[PDB]
Write a protein that binds this ligand. Structure first.
Ligand SMILES: O=P(O)(O)OC[C@@H](O)[C@@H](O)[C@H](O)CO
Length: 188
């Protein structure tokens, strides 16, 4: 493939991701106000749980929440069922990220988390997913397709969830009057 065509091929995939983000910005995001309110009410930490590429985005979002004034950390969904559920205590709020809302490893956390009693939020592509049905607040982040021809590689979905989560973090940060001086304290 010549240089100009290589460049168009790269821009094709970038553009697919751009479209997926646009689809979400153009959507009503009705439950986002309730999402903000639940997060504002959290008296403990916001614990993000995921596996695979969702889990890597969950790690980014925990770090972004923390760096902008909302204490948060990440627990991997498999490590959770091998003891790390012990990191989650009564006042913590749990956000579980799974694009399908069917990932076996993430659903495996749910019986214990129901016993533990924490407020559970899901980020999935469907309110009808197993995970979403089991959570207290389902946030639906619709993703039509992935960017690859096969539609198999998390690309559109991982990027959309990152943009959505970043915007949530920044709205909470602005709402709580997080300052440059607070930012410097956590970023020496
Ligand atoms: O986002 P869910 O549907 O949980 O899928 C988890 C993983 O399978 C996915 O992110 C993984 O990296 C495979 O692509």
């Amino acid at each position: 493939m010549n240089n100009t065509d290589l460049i168009h091929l790269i821009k094709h995939f970038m553009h697919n991701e751009l479209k997926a983000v646009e689809e979400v910005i153009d959507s009503p995001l009705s439950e986002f106000a309730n999402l903000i309110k639940v997060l504002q009410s959290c008296q403990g930490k916001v614990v993000f749980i995921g596996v695979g590429k969702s889990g890597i985005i969950a790690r980014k979002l925990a770090a972004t929440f923390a760096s902008t004034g909302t204490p948060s950390f990440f627990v991997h969904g498999t490590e959770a069922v091998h003891g790390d559920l012990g990191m989650v205590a009564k006042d913590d709020v749990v956000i579980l990220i799974s694009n399908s809302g069917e990932t076996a490893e993430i659903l495996a956390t749910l019986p214990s988390l129901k016993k533990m009693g924490n407020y559970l939020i899901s980020f999935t592509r469907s309110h009808h997913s197993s995970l979403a049905i089991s959570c207290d607040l389902s946030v639906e982040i619709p993703v039509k397709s992935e960017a690859d021809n096969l539609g198999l590689a998390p690309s559109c979905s991982s990027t959309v969830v990152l943009v959505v989560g970043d915007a949530v973090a920044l709205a909470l940060s602005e709402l709580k009057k997080f300052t440059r001086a607070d930012f410097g304290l956590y970023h020496p």
